[PDB]
Scaffold this active site. Structure first.
Site, PDB file in Angstrom:
ATOM      1  N   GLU A  52       0.792  -1.220   0.195  1.00 25.20           N
ATOM      2  CA  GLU A  52       0.048  -0.009   0.035  1.00 25.20           C
ATOM      3  C   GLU A  52       0.791   1.264  -0.002  1.00 25.20           C
ATOM      4  OE1 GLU A  52      -0.650   2.273   2.555  1.00 25.20           O
ATOM      5  OE2 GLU A  52       0.702   1.506   4.007  1.00 25.20           O
ATOM      6  N   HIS A  53       2.167   0.979   0.019  1.00 24.93           N
ATOM      7  CA  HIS A  53       3.171   2.284  -0.105  1.00 24.93           C
ATOM      8  C   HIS A  53       3.648   2.240  -1.556  1.00 24.93           C
ATOM      9  CE1 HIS A  53       6.393   5.016   0.963  1.00 24.93           C
ATOM     10  NE2 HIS A  53       5.831   4.808   2.437  1.00 24.93           N
ATOM     11  N   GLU A  83      11.886   7.385   6.641  1.00 22.04           N
ATOM     12  CA  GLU A  83      10.508   7.497   7.540  1.00 22.04           C
ATOM     13  C   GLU A  83      10.675   6.681   8.757  1.00 22.04           C
ATOM     14  OE1 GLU A  83       7.367   6.218   5.466  1.00 22.04           O
ATOM     15  OE2 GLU A  83       7.244   7.572   4.134  1.00 22.04           O
TER      16      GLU A  83
END
Lengths: 51, 446, 49, 57, 418, 106
Positions: free
Chosen positions: B60-61, B137
């Site tokens: 989903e990234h 991140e």
């Protein structure tokens, strides 16, 4: 007086009369053992601690 | 005029359908000009062994970067051409994708969604670009202290299970997992009947079902590989973690015990009980004489920056507890005054501390559900965890039968003389020991 | 330096009734607390007599 | 359409007797963090996260 | 049903009630007081008036308020801008006659006892230290001071030299002058018409007609740079532009949406914004750019906002300034204008789906105009703008006087007039 | 409760004023009260000109007693010139305490 008047202090009183009743019961029974109190030592013949 | 009782049943109903593969199609129609449409799936970090822990955090990234018919720049350019929004998230147990548009554009919307979940390509150059963004991140959020402590806590209270690993993963593991690992993940977990197609706003049920049958029915309904896992009821241990790091200004602490599951009928009285402790932060208006006995003391002696209570729940287990952030000389005062309020509540609990909590829960249930995005996100979980969306009247009738005795019994069952879990992040040297914390979990008079 | 962390193994110290990591401990919760308190419960009596 | 929030821009403080205080809008949205290296400075008697103000249960 | 029901009164005070069948209900009061309305001797009065919503009143004490609110469950809140204030109350449908007596009396007849006020003056420091942990409340206070002279230059917080000296005569003075009957609006969302009319008819005994309203807010060019230890430079170039309520503000809004104000797709690379792509031709680093618009009732400010690093600050700025020139030179298509006209419609229609945005939308335009108008008229008004207006709006920007503000390590950065 | 006898209540009150002897030291009636937790609050709600006076009438009349003397007769606090400065601040600290206590009762 009036600071202590209410239902909540009477409710705490009826809630902790278990505390007061157990406290007094334990204290009263202990006061028999502590002073070699024969007069209640005989009310139960099960503690034959007098030799 | 409408009373709160005859207005709780005028809410429009919730239709449900099904396909041959097994997709469930739900919706509710409210007569506006706006809609929200999405898909909620049933995979997460809990379904993953030690060999590939961060895998679901690439899929989903990497989903909005180009299918086999429309490359990624084309896809986005198309979606901004309409004037719409896209969003996605994932947790330990769920994953979602959804879009927000205008009501006339449903056919163009349902087609995009089916194109994302069903087939997409994994581009090696895009992998090379993606990996380093992930690696940055990690350090980005290694500096938020309300997120490291809710991870130490999960780590020490579920020591040997698959429910104690992190969403993103260890650093060494986000450096090796490659195209093959990802493609079988996508094949083995993204499938029906683990999926729900949810919509809310000005949608029509029959049109939605017709549009679903066209873009979705080319779908594998028979289980592939027969990979059916068996649920293990969760272990719960009494550990404690301590990290020192003396140069920070403030200290974070959290403490918790075990709780119910999702479908257990013991959740409502625990909600009514946690609403009596409360919450507080040092910018509230009328402190120093607000009704909770813990907030009113912190406001007047100035021990807190803030504290709160939490009730996380899973399919089988849970957590009950509290979080607080504080100075370096006011920790044991906080823990003394915190444990006192739980013990005052295992035992006597009056009949005016219960009507207030009932009102608070009854009134926080309705405001969280006004809008259009929340309703969809509700319909998707409330159907992926029970079925049967449970109207507002049915919740309300479970709040008319909580009483002082009920709170007493459940509080005694789950709190009194149990072993907790404790996590703390520096400067933490006044934190009392495990002996002196454990011995605060039962009075001696009663 | 953050995401990484595994609590090392406490397998050889556990009770034999909670050493399996498959099943919960809410079933294995009353025997422990009924065992470890009888030492004290004996002790209070011993002090008393 | 006649306000100052219908056209995204200058801020508007809020403040409450039950919840935390918020600093106006943010920005139209959050693009500034999608490229890396926005450390979000800290260590200033800091303000906590996720804005635990309104729940469902 | 009854989409709205306006009613004027003999002394202003529009009342507007919508009736529905929801379980909860909200009420709000809207006033025309802000930081814009104070002179040089009492700077800070409105940021303490916003902090004191729970003190003792001639109809209830601060023990009665904070406890009668929490008993049933409701909420009180106050929100402010440079042009207006709003007091809002919120709770269920059977408990609504109660919170309204609290709300209507917190605003009508207060008392300021001089030992609570004297303790509410350590709060200001905490509030101002919290609000200043993100570096664009700071840069947006130096930008209004650098661009104006008198009305709209005041901040929304309290100057440091001033914290301990706010006194209980100035609060009386302020409230008496400005909380006047003919400047207020009462809006209720889930109740019927006569109840509100009755309860607000007890609210006119106080003061008939309006207090002062000076300070026309004339313009000047100001440069203010502030240097500190952050690792990223914030900047802003603006210019004077149109007031709201005119035919050119819509042209400036469509220009803003052509130029690229805000993202749509999560974690995406903005491919439909012109100036982002223009900047990214020779700047391979992290950075961020957007347009800027603010539209107060007498003037406005249109421009650009950039966030960048230390040794590459200039290159970014004097590269997003070239693009804005080209549009002013006739280089503008007619399909991207169509694509930008859809963003306004979508965003505006979504802005009022909730039951909290509906209140603000109605209350905002019930003060500056005095009447209601449905979204259908708005869409027609914003779809009747032509292509030459977007072009000539960008020529007003290029030929005009500027305001900059920056803050960070200003080592490699251009002055205005350069 | 009486009207025609209110001349007599005045007569007995002027006699008991003189028999008690705080006026020969300069004090005033409110200077003598006993400071409990409720009179300790109503003192820090006073303006500054009223609070400064009270700290000099209490230090000059506690030095005359270390010396076993009394002030000259022209400086005796009269009867119709004694002003009750601390009375209004004290009815209000009290009636806010009967309110916090019948809430815990209902």
């Amino acid at each position: 007086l009036s600071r202590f008047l209410g239902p909540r202090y009477r409710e705490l009183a009826r809630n902790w009369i278990p505390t007061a009743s157990m406290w007094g019961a334990v204290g009263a029974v202990g006061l028999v053992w502590a002073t070699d109190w024969r007069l209640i030592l005989d009310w139960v013949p099960y503690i034959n601690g007098k030799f | 005029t409408a009373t709160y009782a005859q207005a709780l049943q005028s809410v429009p109903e919730t239709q449900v359908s099904q396909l041959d593969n097994g997709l469930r199609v739900a919706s509710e129609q409210s007569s506006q000009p706006t809609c929200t449409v999405g898909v909620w799936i049933d995979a997460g970090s809990r379904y993953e062994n030690e060999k590939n822990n961060g895998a679901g955090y690439f899929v989903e990234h990497l989903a909005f970067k180009g299918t086999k018919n429309r490359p990624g720049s084309a896809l986005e350019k198309e979606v901004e051409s309409m004037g719409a929004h896209l969003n996605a998230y994932s947790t330990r147990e769920h994953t979602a994708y959804y879009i927000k548009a205008l009501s006339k554009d449903l056919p163009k919307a349902v087609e995009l969604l089916a194109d994302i979940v069903q087939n997409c390509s994994l581009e090696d150059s895009q992998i090379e670009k993606e990996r380093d963004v992930i690696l940055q991140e990690l350090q980005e959020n290694d500096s938020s202290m309300r997120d490291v402590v809710f991870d130490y806590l999960h780590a020490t209270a579920f020591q040997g299970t698959p429910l104690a690993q992190s969403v993103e993963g260890p650093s060494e593991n986000v450096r090796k997992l490659s195209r093959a690992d990802l493609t079988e993940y996508v094949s083995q977990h993204y499938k029906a009947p683990r999926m729900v197609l949810a919509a809310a706003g000005g949608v029509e049920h029959r049109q939605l079902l017709d549009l679903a049958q066209k873009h979705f029915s080319s779908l594998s309904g028979t289980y592939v590989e027969d990979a059916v896992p068996a649920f293990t009821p969760c272990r719960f241990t009494g550990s404690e973690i301590r990290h020192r790091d003396d140069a920070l200004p403030l200290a974070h602490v959290a403490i918790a015990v075990e709780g119910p599951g999702w479908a257990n009928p013991d959740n409502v009285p625990l909600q009514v009980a946690n609403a009596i402790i409360g919450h507080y932060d040092s910018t509230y208006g009328g402190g120093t004489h607000m009704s909770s006995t813990l907030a009113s003391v912190a406001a007047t002696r100035k021990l807190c920056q803030s504290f709160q209570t939490f009730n996380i729940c899973y399919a089988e287990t849970g957590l009950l507890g509290a979080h607080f952030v504080c100075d370096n000389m006011s920790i044991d005062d906080m823990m003394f005054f915190l444990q006192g309020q739980w013990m005052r509540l295992c035992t006597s609990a009056t009949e005016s501390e219960v009507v207030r909590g009932k009102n608070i829960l009854r009134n926080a249930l309705v405001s969280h559900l006004d809008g259009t995005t929340p309703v969809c996100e509700d319909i998707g979980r409330s159907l992926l965890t029970y079925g049967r969306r449970i109207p507002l009247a049915e919740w309300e009738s479970r709040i008319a039968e909580v009483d002082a005795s009920v709170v007493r019994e459940v509080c005694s069952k789950y709190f009194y003389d149990q072993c907790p879990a404790v996590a703390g992040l520096g400067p933490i040297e006044q934190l009392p020991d495990y002996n002196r914390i454990r011995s605060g979990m039962f009075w001696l008079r009663f | 330096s953050h995401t990484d962390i595994r609590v090392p193994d406490f397998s050889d110290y556990r009770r034999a009734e909670v050493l399996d990591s498959t099943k919960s401990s809410k079933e294995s919760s009353d025997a422990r607390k009924g065992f470890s308190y009888l030492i004290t419960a004996t002790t209070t009596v011993g002090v008393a007599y | 359409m006649l306000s100052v929030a219908s056209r995204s821009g200058p801020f508007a403080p809020v403040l409450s007797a039950t919840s935390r205080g918020v600093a106006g809008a943010l920005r139209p949205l959050v693009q500034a963090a999608l490229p890396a290296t926005s450390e979000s400075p800290v260590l200033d008697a800091k303000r906590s996260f996720l804005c635990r103000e309104s729940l469902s249960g | 049903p009854q989409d709205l029901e306006f009613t004027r009164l003999p002394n202003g005070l529009v009342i507007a009630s919508l009736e529905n069948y929801a379980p909860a209900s909200r009420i709000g009061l809207f006033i025309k007081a802000g930081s814009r309305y104070e002179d040089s001797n009492n700077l800070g009065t409105s940021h303490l008036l916003r902090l004191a919503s729970s003190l003792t009143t001639k109809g209830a004490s601060s023990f009665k308020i904070t406890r009668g609110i929490e008993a049933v469950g409701g909420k009180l809140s106050v929100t402010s801008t440079r042009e207006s204030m709003a007091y809002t109350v919120e709770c269920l449908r059977d408990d609504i006659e109660i919170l309204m007596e609290f709300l209507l009396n917190v605003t009508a007849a207060p008392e300021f006892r001089r030992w609570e006020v004297a303790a509410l003056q350590s709060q200001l420091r905490i509030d101002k230290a919290v609000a200043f942990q993100n570096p664009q409340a700071q840069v947006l206070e130096n930008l209004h001071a650098a661009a104006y002279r008198n009305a709209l230059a005041n901040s929304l917080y309290c100057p440091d030299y001033r914290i301990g000296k706010v006194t209980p005569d100035q609060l009386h003075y302020y409230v008496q002058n400005h909380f006047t009957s003919a400047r207020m609006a009462l809006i209720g969302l889930g109740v019927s018409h006569p109840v509100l009319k009755q309860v607000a008819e007890r609210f006119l005994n106080m003061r008939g007609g309006l207090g002062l309203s000076g300070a026309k807010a004339k313009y000047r060019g100001g440069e203010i740079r502030d240097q500190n230890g952050d690792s990223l430079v914030h900047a802003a170039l603006v210019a004077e532009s149109a007031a709201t309520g005119s035919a050119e503000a819509n042209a400036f809004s469509v220009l803003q949406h052509v130029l690229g104000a805000g993202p749509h797709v999560k974690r995406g690379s903005n491919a439909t914004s012109s100036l982002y792509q223009a900047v990214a031709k020779g700047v391979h680093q992290p950075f961020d750019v957007s347009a800027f618009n603010a539209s107060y009732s007498d003037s406005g400010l249109f421009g650009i906002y950039t966030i960048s690093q230390a040794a590459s600050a200039g290159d970014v700025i004097k590269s997003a300034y070239d693009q804005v020139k080209a549009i002013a030179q006739g280089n503008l298509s007619n399909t991207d204008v169509q694509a930008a006209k859809n963003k306004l419609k979508a965003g505006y229609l979504m802005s009022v789906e909730s039951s909290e945005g509906f209140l603000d939308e109605v209350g905002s335009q019930a003060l500056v105009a005095g009447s209601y108008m449905q979204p259908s008229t708005v869409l027609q008004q914003i779809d009747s703008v032509a292509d030459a207006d977007v072009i000539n709006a960008a020529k007003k920007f290029v030929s005009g006087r500027k305001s900059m503000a920056a803050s960070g390590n200003l080592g490699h950065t251009p002055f205005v007039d350069e | 409760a009486v009207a025609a006898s209110s001349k007599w209540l005045e007569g007995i009150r002027k006699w008991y004023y003189n028999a008690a002897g705080f006026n020969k030291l300069g004090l005033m009636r409110d200077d003598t009260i006993y400071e409990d937790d409720d009179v300790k609050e109503a003192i820090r709600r006073l303006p500054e000109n009223l609070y400064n006076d009270r700290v000099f009438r209490i230090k000059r009349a506690l030095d005359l007693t270390m010396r076993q003397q009394i002030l000259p007769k022209e400086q005796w606090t009269k009867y119709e010139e004694d002003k009750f400065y601390l009375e209004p601040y004290l009815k209000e600290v009290i009636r806010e305490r009967k309110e916090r206590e019948e809430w815990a009762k209902k």
